[PDB]
């Protein structure tokens, strides 16, 4: 009935994604309807050239990355495409094929930018939101994909030098990987992998003692607590754990954070012999 006439607008916009002369308006409208149309992701994936057009919107801003010149209009446009790609990454009917096409690999350059402008920050957050949507599914293939595409080094750079929100999202991604059994075994497999992660977490504890952040501190502690489940990682943490986690440095900030206090207390008990 009345809702069927709206679906024809959805179909026309998806078809208008192909031609560059009608893509920008179709990107705008479809990103708005991505919450009300549950089956939008399979329609986006299985239509002709739709995903290819979204990859085109991504690659077309690569020249704007270096030198950093990304404008507000460019960042808005490409983030409408990333929004629709996030829709595809979330849907269980298209998530596997999304990963099989290695689509996140073309968002990795965005996570490598260091420009502090809002167009670049809005780009990194949107890109991080795509990866966040992936790990929120708690799927084994999402972990195996991220472990093999070298996204952990990208998160550690963001966790060390990004904005306060960027650090928290990147730490959350690393946390979700660590929570999965395969991710913990992968990072603790060699000392080269583990030591590089523990050093970044250590530097973040020093940064948090100067510039405090409640949510960032919570997920930095969750990462440490998860690492302590592994025997090889537990031995190294006994000599490299920041003293600021064992004394009362974060006593006043954690006063009303019940769960982080519980995690931090479980962490110190795990390291006790």
């Amino acid at each position: 009935g009345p809702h069927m006439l709206e679906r024809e607008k959805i179909y026309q916009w998806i078809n208008e994604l192909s031609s560059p002369e009608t893509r920008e308006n179709a990107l705008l409208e479809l990103s708005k309807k991505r919450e009300s149309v549950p089956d939008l992701a399979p329609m986006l994936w299985h239509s002709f050239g739709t995903i290819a057009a979204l990859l085109q919107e991504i690659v077309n801003i690569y020249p704007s990355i270096n030198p950093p010149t990304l404008t507000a209009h460019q960042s808005n446009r490409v983030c409408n495409a990333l929004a629709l790609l996030q829709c595809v990454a979330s849907h269980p009917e298209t998530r596997s094929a999304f990963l099989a096409a290695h689509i996140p690999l073309f968002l990795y350059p965005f996570l490598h930018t260091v420009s502090k402008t809002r167009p670049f920050e809005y780009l990194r957050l949107t890109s991080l939101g795509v990866i966040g949507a992936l790990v929120k599914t708690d799927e084994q293939e999402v972990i195996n994909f991220l472990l093999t595409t070298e996204i952990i080094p990208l998160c550690l750079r963001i966790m060390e030098s990004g904005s306060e929100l960027s650090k928290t999202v990147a730490t959350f991604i690393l946390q979700k990987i660590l929570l999965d059994d395969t991710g913990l075994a992968y990072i603790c497999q060699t000392y080269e992998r583990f030591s590089h992660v523990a050093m970044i977490l250590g530097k973040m504890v020093l940064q948090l003692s100067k510039e405090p952040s409640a949510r960032l501190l919570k997920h930095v502690v969750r990462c440490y607590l998860r690492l302590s489940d592994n025997p090889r990682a537990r031995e190294a943490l006994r000599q490299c754990l920041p003293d600021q986690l064992k004394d009362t440095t974060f006593a006043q900030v954690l006063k009303d954070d019940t769960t982080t206090k519980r995690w931090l207390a479980q962490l110190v008990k795990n390291l006790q012999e």
Binding site: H73, N76, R118, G132, K136, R215
Partner: peptide
């Protein structure tokens, strides 16, 4: 122009705040 970027930026901050916790 610059208003929509700021509007979209605040919405992403709201979105990522829920995602990281919930």
């Amino acid at each position: 122009d610059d208003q929509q970027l700021d509007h979209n930026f605040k919405q992403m901050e709201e979105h990522l705040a829920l995602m990281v916790e919930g």
